[PDB]
Amino acid sequence: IIKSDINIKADFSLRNNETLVRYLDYDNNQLAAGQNIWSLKLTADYSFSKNLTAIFYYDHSFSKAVISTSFPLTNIRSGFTLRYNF
Amino acid sequence: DIERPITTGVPFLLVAADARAAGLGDQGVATSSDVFSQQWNPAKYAFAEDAQGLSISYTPYLTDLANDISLGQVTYYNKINDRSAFAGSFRYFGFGGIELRQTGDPNEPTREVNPNEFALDGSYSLKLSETFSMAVAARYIRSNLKVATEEIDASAAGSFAVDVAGFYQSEEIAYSDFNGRWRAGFNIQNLGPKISYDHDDLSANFLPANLRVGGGFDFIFDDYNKLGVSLELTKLLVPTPPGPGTPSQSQADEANYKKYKDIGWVSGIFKSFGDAPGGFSEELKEITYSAAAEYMYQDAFAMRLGYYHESPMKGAKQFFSLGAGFKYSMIKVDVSYLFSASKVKNPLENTLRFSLTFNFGDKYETY
Amino acid sequence: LTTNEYTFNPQLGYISLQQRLANDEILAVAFEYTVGGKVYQVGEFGSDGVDATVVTGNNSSNQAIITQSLVLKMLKSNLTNVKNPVWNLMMKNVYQIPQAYQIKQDDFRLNILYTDPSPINYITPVQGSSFPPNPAPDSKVEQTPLLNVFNLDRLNYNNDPQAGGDGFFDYIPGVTVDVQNGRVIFTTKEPFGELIFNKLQTGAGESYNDPTTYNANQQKYVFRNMYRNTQAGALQDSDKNKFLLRGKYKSSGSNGIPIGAFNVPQGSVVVTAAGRVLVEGIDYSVDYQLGRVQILDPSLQASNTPIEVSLENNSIFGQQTRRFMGFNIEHKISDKFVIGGTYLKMTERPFTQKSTYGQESVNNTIFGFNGNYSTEVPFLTRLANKLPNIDTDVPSNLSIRGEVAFLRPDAPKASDFQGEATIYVDDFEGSQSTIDMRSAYAWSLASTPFITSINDNTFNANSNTLEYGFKRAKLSWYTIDPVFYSSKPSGISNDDLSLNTTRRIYSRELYPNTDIAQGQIQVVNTLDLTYYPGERGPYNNNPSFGASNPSANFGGIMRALNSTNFEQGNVEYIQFW
Amino acid sequence: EIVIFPNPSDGNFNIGLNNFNFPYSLEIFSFTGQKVFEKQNASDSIISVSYLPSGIYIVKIEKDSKTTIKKIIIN
Amino acid sequence: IFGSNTIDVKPTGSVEMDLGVRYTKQDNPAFSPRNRSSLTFDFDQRISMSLMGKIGTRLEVNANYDTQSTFAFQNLFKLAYTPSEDDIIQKVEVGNVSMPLNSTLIRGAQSLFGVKTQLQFGRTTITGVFSEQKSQTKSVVAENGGTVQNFDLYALDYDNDRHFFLSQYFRNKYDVSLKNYPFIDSRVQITRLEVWVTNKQNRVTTTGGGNNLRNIIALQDLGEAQVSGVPDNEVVVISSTAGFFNNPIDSPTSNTN
Amino acid sequence: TVRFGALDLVRGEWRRYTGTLDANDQNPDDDGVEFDVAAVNIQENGTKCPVNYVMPPGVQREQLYNNNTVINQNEQALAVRIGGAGLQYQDSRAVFKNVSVDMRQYKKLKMFLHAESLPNQPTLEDDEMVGFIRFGNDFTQNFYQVEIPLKVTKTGGSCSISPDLVWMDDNSIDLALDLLTRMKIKAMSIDINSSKRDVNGIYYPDNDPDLEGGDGDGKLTLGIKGNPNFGLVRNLMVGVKSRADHKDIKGEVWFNELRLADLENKGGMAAILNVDTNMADFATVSATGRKSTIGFGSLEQGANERDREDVQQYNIVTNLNLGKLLPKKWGINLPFNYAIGEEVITPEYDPFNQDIKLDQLIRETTDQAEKDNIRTRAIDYTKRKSINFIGVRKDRAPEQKPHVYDIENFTFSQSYNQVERHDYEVADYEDEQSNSAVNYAYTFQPNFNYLPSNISFNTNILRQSNRQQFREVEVEGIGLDPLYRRNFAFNYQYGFGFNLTKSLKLNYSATSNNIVRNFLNDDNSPKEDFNIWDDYLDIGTPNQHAQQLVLNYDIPINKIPIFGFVKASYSYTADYMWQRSSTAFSEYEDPNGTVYDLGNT
């Protein structure tokens, strides 16, 4: 009785950043700073009616530590969003 | 000022979460059946006029300062038969997202935390007689207000509670000048084991066990106008902490507090009626009251006025409340405002509470 | 520092930083300058200084690294010492005009006044004495404005020299004014110090560096301690901070008057030009979205008249709840005569029952009676028609509006102490702030200490060998992790958690009178230091450690302090429970 | 961007301005909505409000037309 | 009491409601094992509703509730009950009311929340209000355009720890050089200057003017010669100045001094 | 095992005052007196050994809402401990604070004091320790001192002592500020070197044998030194002094709830009258008269924000359309604006001494010259006058051919503003400003073309004269020498554009500012007897001159049918500026006496 399209959008990102300090006269390649963050955002839209719609969202981001001053961080925000228009 | 207030865990359970009852002076135990009748009296869910109902309610804190610091509520009721109803409510007090950062790095993955407190409850209401109904509710309360750091554990504190409610709605009785209707209600709620925020059996806090008894009357004019006046009395079922001393100098207070904290909740419910140097006259100071009048026009416009008074020696929360309700086709919108009359700054001042309910399904005749 | 982080005066040889160094920061400089055809250098630049590193050898097993330092000039030291000449390098004649960014001439007024106790812009000699006789024209003190006394007024509008000045502050963008940052710089390095001392000097027996030789006029007016001492230290010289730099500046930015508010209610803006209220459609216009007021009256634009704009801004934050009540009568005697009887009351509800100074609440009442009478006067029209070349028929009108108002103010009954309206100058609950030191991870192993003086060899702190660490006994500093109390780890019993050295401390025990919000932390995370004097500490190579007296050993931790200026912060004591 | 040094602080924290026009207005508000801290002509990064009782506080930073509201924790 | 029974109070806009879970895991070894991860519940509301209509051709309802902006002046709610013009009561306003006064000595209030009523006795108009005021009065003074800002500093309130003389030579030349300002009796032209501070950021970046980190030794007495009117102990900290100087008594500051 | 339940570096708002408060000692960094200042709390010091901390009688804890919970706020008192050697006979130790407090609207200053003996030390007896508040502009020259001998709370037994006995009413300071005002008035007649003053220069009426009633307070001892001002308190000090002759006293004193009480809430009156008339679209008169008394204000104004002044102001603004007095055939737009007005302000408090009522000071003077000086110097009088002829133009005829020599291209604007003032800071203030502007603007309508497309040219004559004479507040005998600022200027900028070719475009403009220096002598001495209309149409010496020139050329190379695709476009902006140097440069003089011209820029 209820039939509608399902719209899915997926966004994956992977960003690596590195900062090296190099000495010319001897091997002293110093790792000054660094980042390695990969994120994934899934969203799925389903329209129950002309006014009521549901959106399933799933964000999953992981930041790996390159230098010890930063800690690995995992963030997962998942769930549903109901929107009703008038 | 306040003299020895009753301290309980998760006090946000006592905050009114909907605009309809907010406009009626924070009472709903004996008002007409509505979708928000879960925090106040689930027993009238069996008296609901509509089959199915959903409701979203918003109470902002620090309205001017910042958003996302609010108490939201989602309620859904469904009466399968003429005699029974299943309801489910979810109250969520939250501060929104908070970013934790220790270094000034522009590129730094930081931790976003949302301290919160939510209660998810489900109630079954069964109509015993044609005018009386009972209800049993089970509630799970979870508190995650603290933030994980060093030497601090942010493990959420959980607890369970049971609510027993009863609602009586008389038939429409004709009088000399009108044909009104009588209502009564009682609710003993938040009955459960103590909640330990530190996850230790030595340190625990009483759940805000509450007893609410109320009664109301509707004057019905021309069959299209209603005026309902309701009065509710509320009493906490938690023992009052000792004051000066009831046996060195600090040792008496230490012994009194040790005796008070070593009391079971089941025994604490019965101990609440007394356990003070004062008598019955001072015992009546433990009861807060609320009186409201709600005018209904065409069953689609509602103008609600209410007055809520606590004892000046505890809580000190007295105010007047205004509320407006509009039903367009199947959607009811309620707005509530509060004028405080107490010396302590009410955090709900200058706050317009919002409530929005949708009703769907077939209609049930009212008796 | 990047060139964006500082500026400098190429002629007067001083620098101004974007970020001030109110801490133990070290400031070093290298600069080269030209005097005519001569070039002088004082520091050591990165282009002409020694190389940062010199490496000798081919492989890391036998390489030698030589890290070389640049020789610079010290402007601020690691440790503050007001008796060293490096302290004198810090300028104390620059004053930052608050919230000023682009001060310009004709839009900046500055005056120097002497408040004792009222603002007076000249200096009187102390009773029983007089200012030095026959002074130079540039050294006049008696009956002289303080702009001339402190060498800030010797030029006219066009910066041309004038005999006694034009009475206005001299605006030189390179000498007395920093335009881009809104700073005022005195023409002397110590205007309130040696300059006023020289103005009041009567003989060679008075030395500015010897306060005991002052002549009872330098004893009153020479505030030397603001230059020879820190500002917190100069606070101890109370009778001298009487000179006041009082002024104003015009902030425009763009066209229109910035009323300092956005999306203001319509009809809440009242504009008064010279005691008369203007008309919102004729004399001025209001841009409510952008919060602008544009004066449309041509006479007022070229008037230099102060215009007062009073609006109502509803972007209020942290304000008490104010109740506004009252009535207004609008009786109509005739079709052109109206009488009004407005009465209003505004009460404020304080957050607490104590009102501190400045954060006060009002309970004001205002009631008034007004009368309006607007008529049409054909006589004026007929008189106008009698004029040579006037033949108009537009009616002439008269209007008289009288009004009387009475204000009865009061304070709310909530903020009364024993029946009287009370304002707390100091209830003493805001004093004595604390800086927490019991964070376990902030402490590290300490160096060997001296116990009476730098010459005391008790714990072998003066040793340059391994004996330096011979007296270090074992010490552990920690906070017992909540896993021991909540989720009992294997091998830990309940007897292990009840010893007064391992048991969990609750705030209700240490602070029985303190109220904690429900859901917050009810436990006290104590900093536990377990000291074993009979056990060998880290990096201790004592051949006979167990054969010595354990009471002669030490166990220590050290910590860095974020705020190093105890005098400015008024760090009063170390308090520990 | 506005940066707040350790969010669960004891009352002593810092601001993370990006080396712009230094005069900014800082206002710290309690959960009651009361005004508990004012700071105009502000340029010092370190903020000492450790006399405030524990809880969450709202920090408003006004920098020219820029307005920012952040939440901090005092524990 | 009402003109009719038609109730066309219609709501427009949208309402959003997010229910989900937030899982966070930070691998900080100093954290407790109980703080390994945090699994909380996210509940969010984005009410963006308007409500406009009439009740019985007598009540006008205008409401706007938007939980995405400042509630001080955006969330609006007005009920206006206007009976027939022949009645004693002309208007009853509930919610966002205003109290406009055609007065100069007594200013009315525009942004209020409360009850406003109006009565008409033949020729007398009585307007009563009881509300809470949602704004504050702000006054500015402007001359020749922009507003006037007043400042009052004291002598002790100088801009400290921000302004530094480059040398004792410049400090002792400052007063004499500015004797006849705006003319400066000095030919000094600072052509190049490098400034070094204590590094506590410990951040390496190529866009911040490059990575220029050097070991630094800063001497207090570097580049200082004697001064004619200042004793040596006020110019240098060196304990013994015997043989320290090798330049005349008024030489400009230089490395060879 | 040592467990720190708390470990803090505690910093205070009240700074320990170093330096002698008594002239008999004159060596503060000695005597071996340990002087400590800290705080005592209800949350931390409820079990204190000598006396447990309790709130003063009638004082309650503040209550707030943290999260739906009522939190009792901490109650704190400032504790001052004197130990070791002890205070000498007249020595005192105190803490201080920098404030900005106006207490002119409150009648009482109240504060709780408590005294106790140090444990394991000789007992402190009653009336030996004296608690004092010293407030004013400083602590050594200009201050009120309020002293009270302290009754000592008896100890030895139980640590818990009732609040009525911890904070005795005999130790509570309850000062009437009119007593301070009367002390100030009485000390006005006391010489600085008088024998009635102490070694510290403080005048105590209680110690005056020739004064009846003393300071008017039987419990407090009041003193004054140097004309302080409680209308603006910049320095506040609380401390302990000794009165034991042959004894060194030791003990701890608590200070609590320093507050102002008994607000003066007499209202105020205001009246406003407006007469607005218009006369046949030719005349418009607007007269306003306001008169407000002391105490009036707005609803939102606080105790120190309401009007402490009597204001009597009027303002008449008149607009005429003089162009309508001429026939409409040749239309002239000649509006004339005349705005006169003045305000007189009488302060509630005399501007001198800043804290005594003007009428009270006038009554208790007994010298006609001094009364006249006070009344005249108190008044703040302002007067403004403005004459405006802005917008003088001749409108175009309904059917007229535009011409370059037409008078319709000219616009005239005259403005004259005069401000007279005299107040507590200026005995006489003149501010004149005359601006005359003539604007010309014509645009043309349809080897290379030499006809300009448009020509613009405007001239300005700005003259500002400001005479400022500061008053001698002490006597109206001489006053200060008047200071003159004059800004006579003549400005003119013109501009014109050419369209020599369909591609070329040449916009030129030149601005010039000259300064008129006819008010100066041969030396750098202004002339007092000068009128702003002396030589109005005088062009002064050049001061600044700027030229701007813009060339745009589309380079029509497309004419040659080999380069028809090139779309070249050349723009050339040229700026020149000449700035006159200050006279300190153009006539700089060496110490040798020779004069050099340093030139312009």
Ligand SMILES: CCCCCCCCCCC(CCCCCCCCCC)(CO[C@H]1O[C@@H](CO)[C@H](O[C@@H]2O[C@@H](CO)[C@H](O)[C@@H](O)[C@@H]2O)[C@@H](O)[C@@H]1O)CO[C@H]1O[C@@H](CO)[C@H](O[C@@H]2O[C@@H](CO)[C@H](O)[C@@H](O)[C@@H]2O)[C@@H](O)[C@H]1O
């Ligand atoms: C646990 C709760 C789960 C959530 C319950 C959602 C119920 C959704 C039902 C849609 C509804 C309620 C409106 C609720 C909106 C509130 C949204 C809140 C937003 C938050 C921010 C809207 O129906 C109304 O709205 C209009 C839409 O604008 C409809 O238009 C049209 O709508 C479409 C034709 O229906 C067209 O396709 C569309 O083209 C048109 O436009 C109209 O039909 C009608 O006016 C009508 O209810 C009806 O649908 C069924 C569905 O099977 C419900 O079945 C129930 O499901 C369980 C109940 O959950 C019960 O257990 C179960 O026994 C029971 O069989 C019944 O109730 C039934 O009566």
